[PDB]
Amino acid sequence: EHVILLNAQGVPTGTLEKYAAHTADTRLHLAFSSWLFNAKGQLLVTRRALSKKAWPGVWTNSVCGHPQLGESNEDAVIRRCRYELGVEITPPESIYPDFRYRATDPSGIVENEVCPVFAARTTSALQINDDEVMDYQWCDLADVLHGIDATPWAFSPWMVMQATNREARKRLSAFTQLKL
Amino acid sequence: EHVILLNAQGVPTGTLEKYAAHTADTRLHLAFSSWLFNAKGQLLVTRRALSKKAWPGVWTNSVCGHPQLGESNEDAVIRRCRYELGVEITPPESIYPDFRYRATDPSGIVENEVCPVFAARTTSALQINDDEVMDYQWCDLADVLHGIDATPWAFSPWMVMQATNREARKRLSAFT
Numbered sequence: 001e002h003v004i005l006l007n008a009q010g011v012p013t014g015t016l017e018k019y020a021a022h023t024a025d026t027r028l029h030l031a032f033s034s035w036l037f038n039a040k041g042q043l044l045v046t047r048r049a050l051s052k053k054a055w056p057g058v059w060t061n062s063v064c065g066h067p068q069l070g071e072s073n074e075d076a077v078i079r080r081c082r083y084e085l086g087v088e089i090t091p092p093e094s095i096y097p098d099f100r101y102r103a104t105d106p107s108g109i110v111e112n113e114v115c116p117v118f119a120a121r122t123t124s125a126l127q128i129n130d131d132e133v134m135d136y137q138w139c140d141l142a143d144v145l146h147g148i149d150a151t152p153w154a155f156s157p158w159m160v161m162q163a164t165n166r167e168a169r170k171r172l173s174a175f176t177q178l179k180l
Numbered sequence: 181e182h183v184i185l186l187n188a189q190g191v192p193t194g195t196l197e198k199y200a201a202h203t204a205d206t207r208l209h210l211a212f213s214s215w216l217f218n219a220k221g222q223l224l225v226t227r228r229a230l231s232k233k234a235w236p237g238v239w240t241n242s243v244c245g246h247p248q249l250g251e252s253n254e255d256a257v258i259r260r261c262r263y264e265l266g267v268e269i270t271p272p273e274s275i276y277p278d279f280r281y282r283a284t285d286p287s288g289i290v291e292n293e294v295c296p297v298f299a300a301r302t303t304s305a306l307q308i309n310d311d312e313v314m315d316y317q318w319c320d321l322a323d324v325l326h327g328i329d330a331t332p333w334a335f336s337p338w339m340v341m342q343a344t345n346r347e348a349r350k351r352l353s354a355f356t
């Protein structure tokens with residue numbers, strides 16, 4: 001697997017082996033983040049596996065990943081949901097296309113990404129991959145938004161940044177409607 | 181180090197080496213929980229190191245541990261406070277003496293404990309043992325309770341149980 005490197009403007013310049021890429025001095029590269037809701041309108045919260053190189057053991061939003069060469073941001077979402085969670089989804093909606101973030105993890109691994117955010121509905125049961133996800137929970141968004149406000153340090157920094165974006169947050173809110 | 185095996189009543193009946201004691205089938209044993217506050221009244225919340233056998237990388241209250249045979253609960257707390265956080269404290273005070281719980285962690289490791297709960301104030305600076313703590317946060321009890329109330333799954337199950345016990349939350353709300 002690789003990542004797509006980008007420059008100052010978000011323009012691709014090439015690719016880089018995923019592992020090799022994410023270090024204490026990660027260069028800019030393409031990524032996605034997705035927030036997934038069940039028919040009931042509940043938000044799927046997940047917990048990164050202890051084996052993840054960056055932010056292991058950390059609670060976060062439904063699924064994050066890296067688009068590969070040839071792939072569309074949305075295909076990546078569909079792929080990753082399947083690989084990490086075994087789940088089928090409705091077409092991802094773009095809810096924060098300009099999100100970009102740089103951050104260091106507890107052991108000093110750096111993420112540095114152009115990371116558009118999406119939301120979608122799950123259309124199948126979960127088949128959790130425990131090489132990627134160690135725990136999960138179906139919640140009401142409002143509870144999750146209340147948790148992030150009370151103790152933001154208990155969750156991934158990107159989960160918090162995206163959730164407090166007013167425009168992304170309202171899109172999240174629209175997905176809490178029950179859909180049959 | 182060891183844990184103290186307890187029968188139906190909390191009577192010690194023997195010991196086990198500590199690592200060997202926590203499994204998918206952990207037997208009932210003795211433990212403590214402890215909530216540490218600083219002079220300003222902030223609660224210290226910690227994150228267990230990824231190497232802990234049970235609940236690695238999980239957010240929980242300040243210090244937790246296993247008294248040895250013939251060791252006072254109060255001494256165990258003081259001992260583990262020195263050991264995991266290099267911190268000196270005021271005499272630990274009881275906040276939930278009859279708490280007991282069994283639970284299972286995401287990898288299937290179980291804690292099964294008689295675990296009386298205490299509180300104290302630190303009298304010196306932290307000096308972290310990264311064998312035990314991987315992260316930590318000084319914060320206001322009320323926000324922590326808000327988070328516990330909103331997203332309990334983001335915290336250790338015994339922390340959640342303790343802070344949702346009416347009497348315990350009362351006494352925790354007094355150290356500030």
Ligand SMILES: CC(CO)CCOP(=O)(O)OP(=O)(O)O
Pocket residue numbers: 031032033054064065066080111113115158
């Ligand atoms: C960590 C972010 C922040 O969006 C994106 C990367 O998600 P990862 O899950 O870490 O990526 P990958 O699934 O490729 O391991």
Ligand SMILES: CC(CO)CCOP(=O)(O)OP(=O)(O)O
Pocket residue numbers: 211212213234243244245246260291293295338
């Ligand atoms: C006692 C609980 C629940 O409070 C968990 C056990 O405490 P640990 O911290 O895991 O024990 P120790 O520090 O001795 O490894």
Ligand SMILES: [Mg+2]
Pocket residue numbers: 063064065080084132
């Ligand atoms: Mg991922």
Ligand SMILES: [Mg+2]
Pocket residue numbers: 243244245260264312
């Ligand atoms: Mg401990």
Ligand SMILES: [Mn+2]
Pocket residue numbers: 003022029031066111112113
């Ligand atoms: Mn990345």
Ligand SMILES: [Mn+2]
Pocket residue numbers: 183202209211246291292293
């Ligand atoms: Mn134990």
